Design a protein around this ligand. Structure first.
Ligand SMILES: Nc1ncnc2c1ncn2[C@@H]1O[C@H](COP(=O)(O)OP(=O)(O)OP(=O)(O)O)[C@@H](O)[C@H]1O
Ligand SMILES: Nc1ncnc2c1ncn2[C@@H]1O[C@H](COP(=O)(O)OP(=O)(O)OP(=O)(O)O)[C@@H](O)[C@H]1O
Lengths: 72, 50, 249, 250, 241, 86, 125, 234, 262
């Protein structure tokens, strides 16, 4: 719904994102959007992607850290 | 002896002002004729401050 | 949710919802204390170098041994929690010697580094289905400078988490972040041995609180021909004044 | 440029505030309704209020410094009256923004007690949240907050719609730690040749202020001896005085 | 806070705490001291005699001997002191059995330490609120030696040390009066360096001291109270000033 | 008491005092400490300076093996009384 | 209000007292009355049977029970902690004393071999 | 936006049945790197990608051999992959001693769905915060798999793990008709994975050092290709 | 103006100095803070064990300041009604501003500013609002001016979360029960007036630490003053002193009730 007033690539699987969230409120699900529509602009592009939605989600819960230590 | 938690403070705040009066600026500067006596049944419980 | 680190912190075996467990990431913070270390590798010679944190003028500073021998062709350093070292290295050498029985040869260097890293992992299951021996994952971050025939001169960084790396020019401990950028930009692949001992006796100067002398530092250098030796004081003082005679000109 | 090098977090801040007031031609045409509310949280000494007094400088519109002491008057249903009038004048004006501070006082949680002596202040905040998200009296007004206790405050004031964005002023890192010195050090008499990459390394996890005290007190120990220019040690002799040995790490 | 209960778990800094809290318990206990020259090593300990009913022939003497060529002191609490010795001397005596050459002192201290670094590994066990001082030569060598243990499980070599109460006074007193590159060279001098190291903190008593020295040829000896009063009083002349 | 003097001569009955009166070795709590602030004023009013026509306290209970002997300091209470059980 | 030195046993409180024992001794005082007094040429041991319902045969279970021919017992308090006790008390005559002395024991050495069967269960949580 | 209990051990349930510490384990993959796999009727393969610390530093192992008809590609917490390899290095060796047979790959994942469940029941232990693939060519054709800590495994025609992945799986959702008929020509199959993984990047440009490949086939053992022997596919 | 002053005390050298340069020089010698050219400190704290002269050291500096001064307790500034404190604290940090230069002195501030918790109650929070409006005044959006606070306390670690940091208090002073050599200067000024001329030999009267502050001194000079007088003798000997010293020290709790740590 909220993405209707946006640009958006045809790349995405909206159901996976539903699966990537647990115990959210619809208001957050909106703010997941703009933080993607915004972060697209910070990266310096115009259309919207998949992963741009993702780092919106981590921008919500204040993960806010790569935390690249010793994995892999 | 100055235990540290919630609603045993409401009397501590009634305790701490009095320590001022006995050795405040003014108290030490004023409490010259005023005088004091106090009693108890124990002194293993009080502050070391009084 | 803000209480993600506040509560999932202390038990080792608690995943936090960010995926990560913290009580290992704090072990990494331990070795940031202690006194610094450096390791530089070469086609000609591996070299180490440390400070010592002069604590009092009456101690006998040959005792605190931030650098050790571990076998005739390997040597270690460590910038971490002390007592948890001597539980490490009395295992690490024991493989190399044991290996000299079951296979009669100077062990490689990485396998040793893989035996250690399969020891700190005993707050859990090791490789071969073992169970446990501790609950305190310990900060002894090593530098294993060695030689073996297949691949020449090497070093490594062995961490408590188990995962390690074949760094070429590393520096760990308190003076790392100011150094490991400085060594980022002054490591050719065509240096000498003594084009490095002076180097590691220049970074160490600027990074450390006190001034530099022989007393507050030392270093070592293995070689395929001679072996692990910890250099001498008057030998080191040779290099220190040599440096100044290079700086002013 | 006077801030202590928390370079990222400002970028999440101003992107709320000024760009939807200067360059809306980007946010709108691509198709995004920008956010209209921030929150700031970090430990103290970290510069939550600093970056907020700043943006008033670069406002290009008004600003408000709400004094939280005027919302708790001792006559019922009064403070709430002050809340709604605070906004009736806002949307009258064009493109107002607002700076609360220490809303842990007002935006506290809720409960039920037959004593409940915080009963009244609850009735004030409800003048706020009903006013922020319901039946759009809002146009272009943004909001700004600040805390040191972001756990206790009620969920309603940290829901999107109200707070579409929040920011963690975590502690600094060594590199960013240095650019704090370069700010607070310019006015000073100091010799050329100190190396900050000790001072940072030797000041573990600590805050903007506890550095500003250090830059200072390196200067004070000069005055205790009537020199005229500082040194490199007097900084170090400050650190041991501020932060304030151990054998089981060497 | 929360991180200051157990042994298994770390701060978000790196500090492990309980070990740091034991060493606070050291400092609620009487002093001790250890000095070495070239032909001698010494040890001191300020005792008490603050009670009259207590019989004094078995006075509480910090000192203990592990073998002929080794001595010991401690600090902290004594309920644990009896343990480490009772495992230490066992180990020295189960060495020459197994090897017929007595202990290199560096072998001993790595077993008094070792029993502390096992009692800081697992919860369900407590550390030792204790901190030692070793003093003894090897067999067939002259080099005088001295270490200290510490419940962290570490140890270092020391030319002069003072631990227990008010040690932060006695150290700097010994940082002047010593010099590593010209030690005392006589068994009198270490004692005089050692006695007046106690006199800063000991209310000019002389019944409140014990000194015990050590030398080669498996030599050890405790000194006489009347042999101290003349090592005491003659100093007082030297501060007639 | 501010009124039991006023309408003197006067007396009191308390159908239960064992509730707020029982020996305790110490208080590791904030609430139960106020129970002492209750009692110590009750014990104070009789013994401190006051009138004499009040015979106020008639402490009722179900047992007597629990009270504070500091309440039983002679002057406070000196006439134990017992009734049948069965 | 609670005490936070009573939910467990191995914890001392500032009056140097332990937690759960003080309440077990109340578990019996809430229980039925039982006794036994003494004489010059014999000893008596008595109690009653507060039969719950009328339909419970009050004979299939004995408050009193034999330990040795010369020794008998009775409880007051909880029941299942009696018939589980005696079944491991009379044994201990037949295990610790009898077979290595031939004969049944005195009366007090039996007690020492009960009371540590009673104290094994107050030393570990 | 408040505390929850029931999220502190794998022993306990939610008030709905969601075991949590498994739902937090398999989030861990999302901050480990990418790696992908492909199948055909006659060949299997997988592509990986490295990450480092500083440009001096060496790169991190991402494929490890287990036996000459198997392999794996991890993505996650490595110390809990070092194990599982050294669990099935044994089983694959057990069989050759006792039965002299080749092990069935689909009775290896079944041996990993178990071990990752024992830790999941009882106090102590963790859910192995890893996610790893499997490959091989036993008698029943080529194979591939995709492990998770929960226990659940699946076989399929080629998948991806890790952060920045779904750009790949959308690709491999297209060409499933194609890259399975690809038989007897490895060197173009392998050029699909390298093409796939490039869909799911953020300005990395795919250096030689960053990459590592494994492959098997009809008669080709598990052989990996890292370094200067890989620049063919760039 | 209270008559106490420097040289009414001489027990110490540094703790006097480490705040004096915050508070008493900039009214005299500020060139030394502009040549070096920094932003000086404004606000300290002074804690420690009691009987050591905290409240004292305010009434000295307030004698020799040349600027105004304010004497307070943290308990004063909480009132029953809801929202009378938080505006009160906004008054005094107003009146001092306009009447610059200025000095403030809160004492036993652990009254109000000790620590925060969630506090499902209705009285504890009005204590917080004052604690929160105060720490707005001392440093927030708008600057305060030239107002130099001085706070006191007996137990920090059991209180004081964020009111104690730089920005608000730029240093922290430690008082403790004295050492030997300080006491040589303490009683000498308490006893610069009594006759006492006979036989005292003070210099081994107070030998060890003895767990006594400077305020156990004032009592002993007192009781041993009149204990002579009750013998109808004025000038004093040692017996009159030790007859007192045994009385004071008697009250001490058995600090070494342990004696477990030989
Ligand atoms: N990043 C920084 N760079 C420079 N100075 C800083 C920085 N952060 C904090 N300060 C110093 O701290 C003061 C403000 O700190 P901050 O904004 O964190 O206070 P605050 O967090 O609002 O206080 P409180 O938590 O009590 O509300 C400033 O006066 C400034 O001197
Ligand atoms: N060096 C000294 N010279 C003279 N008197 C001293 C000295 N040190 C301490 N005192 C004595 O200590 C007393 C003051 O005690 P102090 O002011 O420390 O109490 P306080 O803790 O400030 O009280 P409050 O906590 O209510 O402010 C004075 O009577 C003073 O005589």
């Amino acid at each position: 719904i909220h993405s209707r007033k946006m640009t958006t690539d045809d790349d995405i699987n909206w159901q996976e994102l539903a699966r990537s969230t647990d115990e959210f409120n619809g208001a957050q699900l909106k703010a997941v959007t703009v933080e993607a529509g915004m972060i697209a602009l910070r990266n310096g592009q115009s259309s919207v992607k998949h992963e741009d939605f993702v780092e919106g989600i981590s921008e919500v819960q204040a993960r806010k850290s790569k935390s690249v230590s010793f994995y892999a | 002896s100055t235990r540290v938690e919630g609603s045993g403070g409401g009397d501590s705040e009634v305790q701490r002002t009095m320590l001022e009066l006995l050795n405040q600026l003014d108290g030490f500067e004023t409490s010259k004729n005023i005088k004091i006596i106090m009693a108890t049944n124990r002194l293993d419980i009080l502050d070391p401050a009084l | 949710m803000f209480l993600t680190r506040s509560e999932y912190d202390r038990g080792v075996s608690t995943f936090s919802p960010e995926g990560r467990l913290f009580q290992v990431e704090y072990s990494l913070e331990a070795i940031k204390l202690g006194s610094t270390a450096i390791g530089i590798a070469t086609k000609e010679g591996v070299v180490l170098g440390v400070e010592k944190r002069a604590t009092s003028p009456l101690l006998e500073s040959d005792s605190i041994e931030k650098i050790v021998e571990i076998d005739r062709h390997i040597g270690c350093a460590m910038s971490g929690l002390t007592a948890d070292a001597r539980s490490m290295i009395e295992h690490a050498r024991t493989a190399a010697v044991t290996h000299n029985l079951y296979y009669d040869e100077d062990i490689n260097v990485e396998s040793l580094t893989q035996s250690v890293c399969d020891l700190a992992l005993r707050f859990g299951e090791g490789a071969s289905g073992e169970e446990r021996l501790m609950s305190r994952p310990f900060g002894v971050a090593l530098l294993i400078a060695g030689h073996d025939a297949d691949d020449g001169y090497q070093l490594f960084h062995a961490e408590p988490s188990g995962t390690f790396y074949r760094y070429n020019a590393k520096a760990i401990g308190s003076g790392s972040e100011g150094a490991q950028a400085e060594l980022l930009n002054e490591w050719h692949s065509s240096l000498t041995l003594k084009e490095a001992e002076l180097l590691v006796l220049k970074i160490l100067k600027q990074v450390m609180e006190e001034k530099l002398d022989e007393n507050n530092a030392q270093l070592s250098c293995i070689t395929k021909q001679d072996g692990f030796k910890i250099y001498d004081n008057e030998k080191t003082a040779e290099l220190i004044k040599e440096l100044k005679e290079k700086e002013a000109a | 440029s006077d801030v202590g090098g928390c370079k990222d977090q400002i970028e999440k801040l101003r992107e709320v505030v000024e760009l939807p007031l200067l360059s809306p031609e980007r946010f709108a045409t691509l198709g995004i309704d920008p956010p209209k509310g921030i929150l700031l949280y970090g430990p103290p000494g970290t510069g939550k209020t600093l970056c907020a007094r700043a943006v008033a400088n670069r406002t290009d519109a008004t600003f408000i410094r709400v004094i939280g002491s005027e919302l708790v008057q001792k006559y019922v249903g009064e403070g709430a009256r002050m809340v709604r009038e605070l906004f009736e004048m806002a949307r009258t004006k064009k493109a107002c923004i607002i700076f609360f501070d220490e809303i842990d006082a007002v935006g506290g949680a809720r409960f039920d007690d037959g004593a409940g002596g915080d009963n009244e202040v609850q009735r004030t905040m409800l003048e706020l949240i009903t006013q922020l998200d319901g039946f759009d009296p809002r146009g272009n007004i943004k909001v700004m907050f600040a805390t040191n206790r972001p756990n206790t405050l009620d969920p309603a004031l940290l829901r999107p719609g109200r707070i579409d964005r929040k920011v963690e002023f975590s502690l600094p890192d060594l590199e960013g730690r240095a650019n704090i010195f370069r700010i607070h050090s310019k006015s000073m008499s100091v010799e050329r040749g100190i190396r900050w990459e000790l001072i940072s390394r030797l000041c573990p996890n600590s805050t903007g202020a506890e550095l500003r005290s250090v830059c200072t007190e390196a200067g004070m120990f000069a005055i205790r001896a009537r020199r005229k220019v500082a040194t490199e040690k007097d900084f170090l002799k400050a650190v041991d005085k501020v932060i304030s040995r151990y054998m089981q790490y060497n | 806070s929360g991180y200051d209960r157990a042994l298994s778990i770390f701060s978000p800094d790196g500090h492990i705490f309980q070990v740091e809290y034991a060493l606070e318990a050291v400092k609620r206990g009487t002093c001790a001291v250890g000095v070495k020259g070239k032909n001698c090593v010494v040890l001191g300990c300020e005792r008490r005699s603050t009670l009259k009913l207590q019989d004094t022939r078995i006075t509480p003497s910090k000192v203990s001997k592990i073998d002929s060529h080794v001595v010991l002191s401690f600090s902290g609490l004594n309920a644990d002191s009896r343990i480490l010795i009772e495992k230490a001397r066992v180990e020295a005596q189960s060495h020459r059995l197994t090897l017929e050459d007595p202990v290199t002192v560096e072998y001993l201290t790595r077993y008094v330490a070792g029993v502390q670094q096992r009692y800081t590994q697992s919860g369900g066990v407590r550390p030792f609120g204790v901190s030692t001082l070793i003093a003894g030569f090897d067999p067939r060598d002259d080099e005088p030696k001295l270490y200290q243990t510490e419940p962290s499980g570490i140890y270092s070599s020391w030319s002069a040390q003072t631990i227990g109460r008010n040690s932060k006074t006695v150290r700097e007193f010994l940082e002047k009066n010593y010099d590593r590159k010209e030690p005392p060279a006589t068994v009198e001098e270490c004692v005089k360096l050692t006695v007046r190291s106690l006199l800063e903190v000991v209310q000019t008593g002389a019944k409140n001291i014990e000194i015990t020295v050590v030398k080669p040829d498996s030599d050890i000896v405790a000194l006489s109270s009347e042999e101290i009063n003349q090592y005491v009083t003659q100093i007082e002349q030297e501060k007639q000033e | 008491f501010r009124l039991a003097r006023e309408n003197a001569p006067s007396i009191i009955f308390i159908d239960e005092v064992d509730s707020i009166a029982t020996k305790r070795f110490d208080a590791q709590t904030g609430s139960d400490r106020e129970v002492q602030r209750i009692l110590i004023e009750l014990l104070t009013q009789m013994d401190g300076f006051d009138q004499s026509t009040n015979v106020k306290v008639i402490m009722a209970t179900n047992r007597a093996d629990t009270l504070d002997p500091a309440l039983l300091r002679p002057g406070r209470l000196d006439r134990k009384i017992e009734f049948p059980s069965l | 209000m609670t005490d936070r030195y009573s939910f467990s046993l191995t914890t001392f409180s500032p009056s140097g007292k332990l937690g759960q024992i003080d309440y077990a001794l109340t578990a019996v005082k809430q229980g039925v009355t039982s006794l036994g007094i003494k004489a010059t040429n014999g000893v008596v041991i008595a109690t009653e049977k507060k039969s719950s319902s009328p339909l419970a045969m009050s004979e299939t279970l004995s408050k009193v029970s034999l330990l040795t021919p010369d020794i008998g017992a009775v409880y007051s308090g909880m029941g299942p902690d009696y018939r589980v006790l005696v079944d491991k008390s009379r044994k201990v005559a037949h295990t610790s004393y009898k077979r290595i002395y031939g004969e049944y024991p005195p009366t007090k050495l039996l007690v020492s071999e009960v009371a540590k069967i009673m104290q094994e269960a107050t030393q570990s949580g | 936006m408040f505390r929850n209990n029931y999220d502190g051990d794998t022993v306990t349930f939610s008030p709905t049945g969601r075991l949590f510490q498994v739902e937090y384990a398999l989030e861990a993959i999302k901050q480990g790197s990418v790696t992908v796999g492909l199948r055909s009727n006659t060949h299997a393969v997988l592509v990986a990608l490295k990450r480092n610390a500083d440009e001096l530093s060496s790169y991190q192992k991402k494929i490890i051999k287990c036996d000459e008809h198997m392999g794996l590609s991890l993505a996650g917490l490595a110390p809990d992959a070092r194990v599982l390899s050294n669990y099935l290095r044994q089983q694959c060796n057990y069989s050759s001693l006792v039965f002299n047979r080749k092990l069935a790959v689909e009775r290896a994942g079944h041996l990993l769905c178990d071990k990752a469940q024992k830790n999941t029941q009882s106090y102590g232990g963790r859910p192995y915060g890893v996610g790893l693939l499997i490959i091989g060519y036993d008698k029943s054709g080529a194979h591939l798999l995709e492990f998770q800590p929960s226990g659940n495994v699946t076989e399929l025609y080629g998948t991806a793990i890790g952060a920045r992945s779904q750009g790949a799986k959308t690709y491999l959702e297209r060409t499933l008709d194609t890259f399975i008929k690809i038989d007897g020509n490895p060197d173009e199959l392998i050029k699909a994975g390298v093409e796939a993984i490039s869909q799911s990047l953020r300005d990395e440009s795919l250096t030689v050092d960053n990459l590592s490949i494994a492959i098997v086939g009809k008669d080709t053992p598990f052989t990996i290709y890292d370094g200067e022997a890989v620049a063919k596919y760039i | 103006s209270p008559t106490e002053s420097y040289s009414d005390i001489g027990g110490l050298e540094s703790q006097i100095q480490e705040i004096k340069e915050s508070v008493e020089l900039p009214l005299t010698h500020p060139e030394l803070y502009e040549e070096m050219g920094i932003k000086p400190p404004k606000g300290v704290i002074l804690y420690g064990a009691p009987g050591t002269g905290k409240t004292l050291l305010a009434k000295a500096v307030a004698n020799q300041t040349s600027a105004t001064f304010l004497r307070i307790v943290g308990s004063e500034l909480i009132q029953k009604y809801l929202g009378d404190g938080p505006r009160l604290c906004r008054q005094i940090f107003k009146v001092a501003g306009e009447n610059a230069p200025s000095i403030v002195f809160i004492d036993e501030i652990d009254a109000i500013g000790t620590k925060r918790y969630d506090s499902n109650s209705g009285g504890e929070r009005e204590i917080q609002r004052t604690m929160l409006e105060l720490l707005n005044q001392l440093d927030g959006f708008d600057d305060r001016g030239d107002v130099k606070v001085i706070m006191a306390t007996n137990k920090i670690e059991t209180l004081d979360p964020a009111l104690i940091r730089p920005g608000r208090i730029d240093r922290k002073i430690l008082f403790e029960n004295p050492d030997l050599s300080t006491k040589k200067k303490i009683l000498g000024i308490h006893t610069s007036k009594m006759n006492l001329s006979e036989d005292v030999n003070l210099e081994t009267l107070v030998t060890t630490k003895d767990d006594l502050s400077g305020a156990d001194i004032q009592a002993m000079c007192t009781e041993a003053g009149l204990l002579a007088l009750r013998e109808r003798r004025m000038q004093v000997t040692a017996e009159d002193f030790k007859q007192a010293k045994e009385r004071v020290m008697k009250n001490k709790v058995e600090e070494n009730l342990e004696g477990l740590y030989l």
